[PDB]
Design a protein around this ligand. Structure first.
Ligand SMILES: Nc1nc2c(ncn2[C@@H]2O[C@@H]3COP(=O)(O)O[C@H]4[C@@H](O)[C@H](n5cnc6c(=O)[nH]c(N)nc65)O[C@@H]4COP(=O)(O)O[C@H]3[C@H]2O)c(=O)[nH]1
Ligand SMILES: Nc1nc2c(ncn2[C@@H]2O[C@@H]3COP(=O)(O)O[C@H]4[C@@H](O)[C@H](n5cnc6c(=O)[nH]c(N)nc65)O[C@@H]4COP(=O)(O)O[C@H]3[C@H]2O)c(=O)[nH]1
Lengths: 693, 693
């Protein structure tokens, strides 16, 4: 064995042609050893003697890709001080670019004996842990330009890697549920058919199946439990896990880009799968516990603003570095187009408060590689002062939780005031105008992975997560949902016509709103989870997508509605409306036909709207200063539980181009052409859009 | 004119091929405009309407390099709230790649009327201000190999651009004092002959001549008062200022890099040339004053932890972005090999205290472009708790001012210096071992740009800065210097021999000490500033270097040859610290008596003589390929006594390789062989080195 001192950069194992340079960090490690696993277990351990700025490194010539390796950190095991170092635990490389194997859940991976979490577990973690793998970084991106799709053209399709394709009757069994199947021409074509411009891939950072989930029959399905912020999840890899999963992902990206679809993956930097103090010792708890994790006062115990065991120290540089070194890795090495942060408020907690001047934001705001990709956030967490919708720095885009809630309530029949829903159509002027942002700062969505799918949104009052093994105690207890007549599947055509048409209203409201809509995967086919509103553990047919007449008219409804937003730049505006000076650009009307005053705006019980969107008055430039022209539209909302009669504003004509009411799809089909003062009766819980050419 | 919305990245005027894209930041600007200057002083104004996260921008097709431009920001003038925006002033671009012309000091560039600080100046600053210029970023750096000289090989040579070459009887008059003159083969030849491996360039960031200094007959010479952290100082350019200066500096880097010399820029990010209030509104004060500068708890006034007017807000990311956008720019666009930071404690002041976890340090530690270039700091600033020698994060290097003070005290004969002298030779084990650093974290230096030059350090007891006009009140008041028998130029052969040989002791101790040495420019020819110890404003014979035409060349071949002995022998540049004890002896301290010292005779009050044995076979360090570093064993003999002490050699034979005392110069001239037990009368204030393998 030949060991050269190597270099401290870049962190992790990098293959310099001849051999591999390993660089691991621990500022509280007396000794660190690099273990070279063989095909028969059997470490070949090497001490990384060279410590430079607390990074221990060496260059081992002859070591090549596919080499299974890990670290053994000889340090003090003193939970009283917060150090849980253990040289009996084969730690992963946090910067591992490909991790092989799965966690063999037992007494050996934990670092404490199963009865005394105060003591030391001198059991070898090697045969039961994940192994980091050396990776040959070569990949030939040919013509691979990043499709820098402008923000006001985006249609984000939230989809899971395994759930999108496992039930596709078009891919071989080998590709069903993996990255390569996501790159099949039958799947990319379907998103092309749907019109989406950015694929939001639920976490692909390799995660661990929770021990509590595994010793219950279930497994971690969503994967918001990552351990390697640099390695694709080896379970979504058909080509193998010895560094071939990073090949699948890179090729699945270039195949998506070859059709013009952006890859915005889901990142979970707020917590690790090592969980709380009762979790395993896999990667970081064994490297340097107090410099990676937000230790609670009384270091033994962890603070957790994510509700999932632990949280990361967002003030230590060695964590911020690891997060950006990850974010840049997926932009430059994996060619990812954007990021969506789960529980993004946790990243802003520099000390305890949600600091929008925290080093995380300042870091992301300045770095050229990361500040240019689409930065999307779930702008809250489960800690004190967590709800931060409308507070992130202006360089960010937020999941508009105030959109999903204040629109779910509208078609729910709630007396949620019109002005609440009205600003959400305008693109949350209240939330994002004063911060210095644009309507494109609101990632509008009605459904997502959390809560009900779009069909279960109109099929269930409350959750049915008894299958999750937690006794219906997990997930949202109330989703602002309405079962439309009967909770669950019903043969009655009365509610069936209602539900599938309520589905139409949510899709029409979503594509007619301002900002950036997002669709959970399967809502084109009326995907259903049986009332399970928290499917993080259902890695089964509950959360797969059922592909192959009612599930095709709703599909061609969605396809043709996204076409309307694409064709017409009014529903995707680059600035806010103002409605009045002291040709208006937006006019609000009563179904009676007369303009709305301030009293009837704050009217207590009101459910009907008629919004005029001017097409001549998009006070915005095009790419080359061109004036953006469009047809004028006339949106007629009616959340009333009774048929309401809508009057249009006299002498000139109109063209109804949208109507939720008929079970054949009005975006798909054609419309009767209405006139100015025309009496037009509109069904209860319906929508209608006109068009003046 | 044709004005496209364009991009918000990158900040500044970036040329693309068709035209230029301009992007300026202001979160406190109701309107920003882009003034395009012609050669007849006329403006072509363009509103940069398209704000994007407070960065206003437009793409102007047809605008090409050499286009002088500026910004005018319409905003509320309200120092009571912290705003000093004034459209009357033509603001520079902080991301200026090239700034042309100089500041025409008048009553125009102040932003306030000269008699009322809280009023508003409405005088057009355009004809009196500096002009940012669009640059064509093309350069064909050919085979540029960044000479990634190791840290245990570095020899930093602090040299000014104008001082190094203005008096060279080799360069053309046009090249003297400019960037290209620095790249002349006669200059890079002298740097080669010397042994330097890195050129510390005193600030090349474009600074402003202080009005206090222009209207007093002087000028800002050192240049630690800068406005453009992206433009090279135009007054060091013999090729022009319309962007032509960036061409000089780039070619001045490839010329040095061709001869294997690193350009380690000196940067001043703590303060700006706009100073406090009562100062000019040039670049940032008019753009967004409150989010760039550390305002006081009276936003009208400016917090000043540098004693030079103002200080920057190292928490607002728009500043942090600018500092890294700048630091990255010089690395990946100007091919600069490292940065030396001015008053680098100010960069750590996130709110008031000198923070270890300052967002700046977290930012620099992580960025791959900047964390890899040589990061060196002067670790203090004039604020509370500013003295931070040995407190910067372990990735950093520091001017070890304690080395300077201790070695000056020893050769002064200060009372109890031998103890400390020993840890400053060991490489400041007290200041750097516990931090997790190496001896190379101590940039050892006796003289620098500040204080005395090496000749004045042994010729003057106190400053003679009457040239600076402040009545001998500026600069260090006691520099811990000794005049060696007469203050100023003397004819005495006694003092002259004492001084020139005292020069031989600072140079021998500096090159013999652990860590990276540092020589200020000119000390090879015995450079003299006449007793002026603060030459920030002397742009004249006082600080320019005299090139030699016997004593000024004998000292030169002493210096050049001692860099040889540090090169030829890895003991003096050890990669680790000494320990000297098992429980191989790699260091041994002996008394001139010839016996090993004890703890009582280590803290002996009256001691001025030392004999250190440096083991050459016991270099417990691996080489690039794991080679065992071998060397001859060296024996150093220090005598800071005022009289001739008799030194005894321990243990065979030894060879006198260095002797400060004889004026023939005995770094290069060989010495006799000492027995190994025999006494040797060593002269007072002399130093000797023995060699034996
Ligand atoms: N950033 C950085 N700094 C370095 C490095 N190597 C040495 N330093 C410095 O070198 C000094 C002496 O180490 P030594 O000659 O090997 O003598 C050392 C060494 O033999 C051993 N030691 C310390 N750490 C280690 C280690 O991690 N592995 C091994 N095998 N020995 C160690 O005990 C002696 C005293 O150790 P220290 O208190 O640490 O004092 C250390 C430490 O301050 C390095 O690779 N990176
Ligand atoms: N010539 C000029 N006029 C200005 C400017 N700022 C505000 N206004 C004018 O005053 C109207 C209301 O401004 P607002 O509060 O910023 O409300 C703004 C603002 O919230 C939003 N927004 C508009 N433009 C931008 C932009 O370029 N960048 C970002 N991040 N947000 C914008 O569009 C909304 C409506 O703007 P308008 O339809 O144009 O109607 C605007 C505009 O005519 C400016 O910098 N230059």
């Amino acid at each position: 064995m030949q060991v050269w001192p190597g270099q401290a950069y870049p962190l992790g194992a990098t293959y310099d042609g001849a051999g591999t340079n390993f660089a691991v960090f621990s500022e509280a490690a007396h000794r660190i050893e690099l273990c070279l696993l063989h095909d028969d277990g059997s470490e070949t351990a090497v001490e990384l003697r060279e410590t430079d700025a607390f990074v221990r490194h060496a260059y081992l010539p002859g070591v090549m890709p596919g080499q299974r390796y890990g670290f053994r950190v000889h340090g003090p095991y003193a939970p009283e001080r917060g150090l849980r170092c253990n040289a009996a635990k084969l730690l992963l490389d946090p910067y591992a670019r490909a991790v092989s194997g799965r966690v063999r859940w037992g007494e050996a991976v934990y670092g404490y004996p199963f009865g005394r979490p105060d003591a030391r577990n001198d059991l070898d973690s090697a045969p039961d842990t994940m192994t980091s793998v050396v990776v040959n970084p070569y990949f030939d991106w040919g013509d691979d330009r990043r499709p820098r799709t402008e923000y006001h053209h985006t249609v984000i399709y939230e989809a899971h890697v395994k759930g999108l394709t496992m039930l596709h009757p078009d891919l071989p069994e080998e590709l069903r549920g993996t990255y390569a199947g996501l790159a099949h021409p039958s799947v990319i074509g379907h998103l092309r058919e749907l019109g989406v411009t950015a694929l939001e891939l639920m976490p692909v950072h390799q995660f661990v199946n929770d021990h509590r989930l595994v010793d219950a029959g279930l497994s971690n399905y969503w994967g918001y439990n990552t351990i390697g912020f640099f390695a694709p999840h080896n379970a979504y890899a058909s080509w193998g896990d010895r560094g071939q999963q990073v090949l699948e992902f890179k090729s699945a990206v270039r195949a998506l880009h070859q059709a013009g679809i952006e890859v915005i993956l889901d990142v979970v930097y707020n917590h690790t799968a090592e969980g709380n103090h009762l979790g395993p010792t896999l990667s970081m708890r064994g490297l340097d516990n107090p410099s990676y994790y937000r230790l609670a006062d009384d270091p033994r115990y962890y603070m957790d603003t994510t509700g999932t065991g632990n949280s990361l120290l967002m003030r230590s540089p060695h964590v911020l570095q690891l997060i950006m070194d990850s974010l840049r890795y997926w932009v430059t090495e994996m060619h990812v187009d954007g990021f969506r942060f789960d529980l993004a408020a946790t990243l802003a907690r520099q000390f305890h408060e949600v600091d929008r001047l925290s080093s995380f934001f300042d870091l992301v705001q300045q770095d050229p590689v990361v500040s240019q990709v689409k930065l999307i956030a779930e702008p809250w967490d489960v800690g004190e002062g967590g709800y931060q919708v409308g507070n992130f720095p202006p360089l960010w885009t937020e999941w508009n939780g105030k959109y999903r809630d204040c629109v779910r309530d509208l078609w729910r029949g709630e007396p949620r005031t019109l002005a609440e829903f009205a600003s959400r159509l305008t693109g949350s002027s209240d939330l994002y105008q004063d911060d210095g942002r644009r309507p494109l700062a609101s990632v509008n969505f009605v459904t997502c992975h959390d809560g009900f799918t779009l069909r279960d949104l109109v099929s269930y009052n409350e959750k049915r997560n008894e299958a999750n093994g937690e006794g219906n105690r997990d997930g949202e207890n109330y989703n602002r949902s309405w079962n439309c007549g009967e909770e669950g599947e019903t043969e009655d055509v009365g509610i069936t016509e209602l539900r599938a048409r309520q589905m139409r209203n949510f899709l029409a409201t979503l594509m007619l709103s301002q900002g950036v809509p997002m669709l959970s995967h399967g809502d084109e086919f009326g995907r259903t989870q049986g009332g399970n509103n928290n499917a993080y553990c259902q890695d089964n047919e509950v959360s797969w997508v059922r592909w192959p007449e009612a599930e095709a008219t709703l599909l061609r409804f969605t396809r043709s509605m996204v076409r309307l937003r694409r064709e017409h730049p009014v529903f995707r505006r680059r600035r806010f409306f103002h409605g009045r000076p002291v040709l208006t650009d937006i006019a609000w009307f009563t179904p009676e036909g007369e303009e709305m005053t301030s009293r009837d705006w704050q009217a207590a019980h009101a459910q009907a709207l008629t919004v005029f969107l001017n097409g001549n008055a998009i006070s915005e430039p095009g790419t080359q200063g061109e004036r953006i022209a469009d047809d004028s539209f006339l949106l007629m909302f009616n959340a009333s539980a009774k048929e309401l009669e809508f009057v249009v504003p006299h002498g000139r004509y109109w063209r109804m181009v949208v109507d939720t009411s008929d079970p054949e799809g009005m975006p798909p089909q054609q419309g009767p052409e209405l006139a100015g003062g025309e009496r037009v009766t509109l069904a209860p819980l319906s929508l209608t859009v006109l068009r003046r050419p």
